[PDB]
């Protein structure tokens with residue numbers, strides 16, 4: 305019967321190419337991915353949001369809090385700039401779930 | 409680990425009433441149907457695939473019982489409310505509902 | 516492209532008809548639904564498993580721990596009787612998630 | 620509230636590493652992945668089943684019908700050998716969806 309296709313952006317980008325987001329390790333590569341994600345996709349997928357949360361918590365795990373601050377500040381800018389409420393809510397979720405691991 | 413909760417609007421509403429024949433979350437009559445519709449587009453910021461597909465089924469069930477008259481109203485109502493949203497997710501949800509309904513109508 | 520349909524058993528049963536499972540309030544009605552679910556369906560759906568967990572936590576909420584014990588003991592029997600690992604795992608998940616709410 | 624985690628096996632294996640299954644191109648690599656998937660996982664995920672269907676259709680796309688026959692014959696053996704009905708049904712779905720693309 306009728307169906308919708310939920311395509312993971314980060315799965316595609318990883319398929320096209322140690323804390324990494326869709327394979328990207330360096331901050332300039334990571335911000336290129338996040339820019340393409342936020343500006344190209346209209347509805348962020350749960351999988352992709354959770355893949356970003358894992359990247360951030362992996363940064364916390366390897367104590368690279370410098371990169372984490374850059375990643376969060378960049379996402380804050382782009383996602384809060386968005387006219388779409390889904391991207392505003394996606395940021396709150398990412399932030400709230402990162403804060404929890406930081407506060408441990 | 410971290411998680412998101414995808415709650416079905418029409419499942420909730422069917423639990424609150426529920427059922428009375430073609431229905432949307434239990435609602436059979438147009439005036440109770442446009443009401444469940446009314447409440448969905450207006451409250452929910454991100455529509456769920458389940459709810460979108462529950463609407464498509466209702467519409468195709470109308471086509472099935474040849475109630476093309478009620479179907480005209482149901483689509484005409486959603487065409488009104490969904491197209492007039494600022495959120496792209498609701499614009500895309502309408503295209504999907506329409507495109508899938510048109511296919512069955514065009515048969 | 517190709518796709519799979521996840522069909523909710525409890526949604527169907529509710530459609531065909533204050534703590535309730537697919538509309539059923541009385542224990543004899545609830546055990547009839549659970550019997551039909553476990554003995555009729557080959558692969559339990561996440562939605563249906565979570566709909567059972569909600570019913571069980573709603574019982575805890577209205578302090579009807581008598582009904583809850585009957586519901587769990589009945590599901591233990593039927594789901595552990597199953598040859599299919601999916602039904603065995605579905606029970607563990609329901610039990611583990613009910614214990615959490617009981618322990619609160 | 621209560622939740623289930625659907626972890627993609629092939630996403631994990633691709634993350635740990637032109638037609639490929641989770642990065643694996645050569646048949647011995649592909650059969651190693653399929654063996655670990657079928658023998659390690661109790662309930663196959665929709666995403667992973669659809670990732671296998673995409674690999675087979677990608678083989679059809681590059682006209683490598685030799686590799687496709689090896690992949691299907693191997694999956695037939697392992698998935699039909701399984702005690703779990705979910706794996707028997709997963710094979711039928713993969714085969715039926717491959718036949719559709721072959722019939723085009």
Ligand SMILES: [Mg+2]
Nearest residue numbers: 396397399400
């Ligand atoms: Mg917040």
Ligand SMILES: [Mg+2]
Nearest residue numbers: 503504506507
């Ligand atoms: Mg269209």
Ligand SMILES: [Mg+2]
Nearest residue numbers: 607608610611
């Ligand atoms: Mg346990």
Ligand SMILES: [Mg+2]
Nearest residue numbers: 558559662663
């Ligand atoms: Mg399953």
Ligand SMILES: [Mg+2]
Nearest residue numbers: 711712714715
């Ligand atoms: Mg077949």
Ligand code: NI
Nearest residue numbers: 305306307518
């Ligand atoms: Ni279908």
Ligand code: NI
Nearest residue numbers: 409410411624
């Ligand atoms: Ni979790």
Ligand code: NI
Nearest residue numbers: 416419523526
């Ligand atoms: Ni439902």
Ligand code: NI
Nearest residue numbers: 309516517518
């Ligand atoms: Ni499709």
Ligand code: NI
Nearest residue numbers: 413620621622
């Ligand atoms: Ni939760």
Ligand code: NI
Nearest residue numbers: 312315627630
């Ligand atoms: Ni994935």
